[PDB]
Amino acid sequence: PPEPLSLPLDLAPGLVDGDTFLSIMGALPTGVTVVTTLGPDGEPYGLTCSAACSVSKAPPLLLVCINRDSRVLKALLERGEFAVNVLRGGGESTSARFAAPVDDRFRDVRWEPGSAGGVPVMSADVVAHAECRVAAALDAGDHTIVIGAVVAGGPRPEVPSPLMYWRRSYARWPV
C-alpha cells in the first residue's frame, strides 16, 4: 500500500483562509459519484466523491481527488482498478451512506462486479458508471489525485435525472 509521490508545488504566502476557500468552492455546483474498488480480500469498498471530472478523450482518462488517509484510496491503489458510479436524482441517501463513518458500507446495497477485475457497479443507483485502470496517482495537498484510464462502463439513459449538490442542498433534473 505505497504512498503516491507529492506533486512539487510553488506555494506563495498570501493564500486564502480555509473558510474563504469553501465559500468560493461551495459556489461551484457538482455531481455526486461513489468511487468503488475491491480489497486484497475481495470485500467491496467505496466513498462518496464529488471532485471528479474528465481529463482526456484520447486516451480516455478521468480523475478523482480523495483524502490521503482514505481506506478506499489504499484498497484502490493496491488493486490498480476502480469504478466511478455517477449517482441518480433519487440517491441522496446513497450519498450519505458512502460518506458515513462505518466499516460495512455495502450492507444491503445492490451491486454487481464489473468486467474489469470485479470492481463494484451500483447499477440500480446510477445514471452512468466508468471502470478504470489506475493510470497515475499524485499527492496534491491534503488530497491524492488518481487518474483512471476508462476500460469499460456505460450510461443509463433509462434514468432521467442525476444527483447534484450546491450550497448545502441536493437537487435533480425537473421531470
Ligand X SMILES: Cc1cc2nc3c(=O)[nH]c(=O)nc-3n(C[C@H](O)[C@H](O)[C@H](O)COP(=O)(O)OP(=O)(O)OC[C@H]3O[C@@H](n4cnc5c(N)ncnc54)[C@H](O)[C@@H]3O)c2cc1C
Span 24-53, contacts to ligand X by CB under 6 A: 25-26, 30, 32, 47-51
**What gap in Å lies between CA 142 and CA 134, rounded to an integer?**
20
Q: Is position 158 an interface residue for a copy of itself (rule: CB under 8 A)?
A: no
Can you tell me which residue has the cell 464489473? 114
For a copy of itself, the binding residue among 35, 63, 109, 121 (CB under 8 A) is: 63
Q: Which does 102 bind (CB under 5 to 8 A by kind): a copy of itself, ligand X, none?
A: ligand X
- Cβ count near 56 (within 10 Å): 13
Q: Which does 14 bind (CB under 5 to 8 A by kind): ligand X, a copy of itself, none?
A: a copy of itself
Using the contact rule CB under 8 A, the part of the chain among 3-11, 35-43, 95-103, 105-113 near a copy of itself is 3-11
Closest contact distance (angstroms) between CB of 60 and ligand X is 8
**What gap in Å lies between CA 61 and CA 170, rounded to an integer?**
27
Task: Tell me the backbone φ, ψ of residue 144, rounded to 5 degrees.
Answer: -105, 125
Cell numbers describing residue 141: 495537498
Task: Tell me the backbone φ, ψ of residue 51, rounded to 5 degrees.
Answer: -90, 75
Q: Is position 37 an interface residue for a copy of itself (rule: CB under 8 A)?
A: no
**What gap in Å lies between CA 60 and CA 152, rounded to an integer?**
10
Closest contact distance (angstroms) between CB of 49 and ligand X is 4
For ligand X, the binding residue among 4, 39, 43, 65 (CB under 6 A) is: 65
Q: Which does 93 bind (CB under 5 to 8 A by kind): ligand X, a copy of itself, none?
A: none
Q: Is position 121 an interface residue for a copy of itself (rule: CB under 8 A)?
A: no
Cβ contacts of 127 within 8 Å, gap of 6 or more: 86, 87, 88, 155, 156, 159, 161, 162
Q: Which residues are annotated as a binding site for NAD(+)?
A: 54, 143, 165-168
Q: Contacts with ligand X in 124-163 (CB under 6 A)?
A: 142
**What gap in Å lies between CA 112 and CA 114, rounded to an integer?**
6
Q: Which does 99 bind (CB under 5 to 8 A by kind): a copy of itself, ligand X, none?
A: ligand X
